[PDB]
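Re: [help] complex structure
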Amino acid sequence: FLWRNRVGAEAVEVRINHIRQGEVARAWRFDALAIGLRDFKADAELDAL
Amino acid sequence: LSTASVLAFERKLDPSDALMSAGAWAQRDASQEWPAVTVREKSVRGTISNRLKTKDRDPAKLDASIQSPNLQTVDVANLPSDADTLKVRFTLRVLGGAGTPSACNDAAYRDKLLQTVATYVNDQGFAELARRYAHNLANARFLWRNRVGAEAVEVRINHIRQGEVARAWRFDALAIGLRDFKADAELDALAELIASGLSGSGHVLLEVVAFARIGDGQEVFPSQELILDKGDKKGQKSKTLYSVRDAAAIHSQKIGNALRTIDTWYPDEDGLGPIAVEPYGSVTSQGKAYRQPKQKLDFYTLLDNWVLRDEAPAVEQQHYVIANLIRGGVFGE
Amino acid sequence: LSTASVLAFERKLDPSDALMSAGAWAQRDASQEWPAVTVREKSQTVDVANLPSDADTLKVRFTLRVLGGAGTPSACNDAAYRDKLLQTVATYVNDQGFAELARRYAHNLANARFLWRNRVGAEAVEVRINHIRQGEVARAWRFDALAIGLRDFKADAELDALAELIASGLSGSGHVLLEVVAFARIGDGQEVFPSQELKTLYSVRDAAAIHSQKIGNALRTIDTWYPDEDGLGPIAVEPYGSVTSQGKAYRQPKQKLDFYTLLDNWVLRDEAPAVEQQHYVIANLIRGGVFGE
RNA sequence: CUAAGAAAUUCACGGCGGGCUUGAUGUCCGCGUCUACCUGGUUCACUGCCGUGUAGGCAG
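Output below.
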């Protein structure tokens, strides 16, 4: 979703928060540059999402 | 095979706005706290010193009005008293990915343009182009007038991988000229970094610190604007100076201009040195566009000779076309 | 071949702001650490300031900037106008040295031409001027404004070295950096006259200064070939030169000695205006402006 | 001397009731504005000065 804004960046981190009340019920973090822009490979904290 | 009617090219070598500060030499072990310079808008009278017209000339309105002086508002920024050196600081991103367009219409033309620029890269890479960009980053060409008549300039280029510096440089650059492109091994070490950047082989983030001694309390040269067309009143605004938040500043396009002075393969003034890379290569302050379409030399003829009909031009016109493809712009129809 | 729709020349000998400041005598060799002048307003609501009772002194602070190679211009539309101007500027350069400009610059450096209204009732004038390469000085002077009278150009022994230095300067034979500063004798409790804008005396903060253009005017009183009467003295160099103080505008355009026709003749078709005009022509090229169509 | 010459149209009124507009989306791309300077306008045709009456030493 960062279209041109991610191009040529040192570090890109994504934080995803599930909101089920006023409060947040769950909290993910990702290394967006480590996760591939091309391949849909799988791991544990991502299929937890 | 035909050119697509909508082309577009994302630029590479992205500069930012530069920010001026001020201070003395040899406090540059601890020069991370110098105060900036201030754009000062005042009112200063002038003279009546322009050409009086020949249309409706009359000594009842020119010979009587000449002895009534002018009334203007000059906006000039100046250095402080103890300060004697401008620190001009900006950053630069050598992106890379410099052969694929952002927009297109015909993927056959894009399949031809990709293999054309790849056949360019795979015998001479981005080596010599990064040599001359490292030269323009070496000398203080991006100080368009603040270097003219300096005692010493010191150019520290820092390469950045994390919060702090990963690689340093120091360049003597009043010794380095503006026409003869001699080089050095550390100039080559900068050029290898920029060539790695343009080839899509890593990230380059050059924090560019450029000192230039002028003198105590001297005059500084930031950039200028265009004040018209959206509220053009009777004209009580002469000339102001560009600024990020309460400090004077050069625009990004003028530094980009001064960094892409690469062109030396035009037949007008060959020994008289380089100019900026532009399609229909023109110094507009000179007033005369080199590289006419009357000849065979401009970018819009080289590009579609080399892409469509495979007529690969000379081994410097390749350099010029690729300097245009790093420049960007709306091509096509 | 015709005129030039845009022209832009770059300035030479630009000063900084001449801040005023005070002190005393026999501490003038310890003037790195010295006090300043004050700004106050009295009863309309206007400004007027004053020296203290301990001080006859007043002090000046500015420094200079030559560039070199002033014939070659920086904005035009005609390439042929450059190709017709290069022969003229090189013809004026190569056949004679620039010291005739340089004496008439450097004596205004040496005299009190920049101390305009700082000797309206003074007694002893002493000026000290530095040639700064680096963090110290290496060619020091200390000049006098009593000796050379403020309307003639008669040279002395100090003047030739500074003249050949500045003529190396503006011709491109080496960048010079002067610092021209002065020490005054005003009066124990005397009213000051700084600059203004377009009443409020022009107040730099916690001091008092006069702008750049007054000294960039004062150091180029080179017009003494103006037509009518040459016994009066030097006034400065202006295309369409009008002066408020002497009232009458020298060098009128309805007769042929204004800048906009001698430039046309001297530059383009290679016919020469007079050798009693040349240093005024090149002083106009030193000043700069928008010289269009 | 006019298809000339002449003329009172009067009066009265219930339009009324009902309602789901739905759903989808990449505006991308590029740029040197350039040079130049002398307000003591008189920030009141005079402020404030021995007699409120027309002659005067003052910060001029």
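Residues 6-11, 42-48, 73-75, 116-117, 191, 193, 195-201, 210-214, 216-218, 236, 238, 243-245, 287-291 of chain C lie near RNA strand D (CB under 10 Å from a C1').
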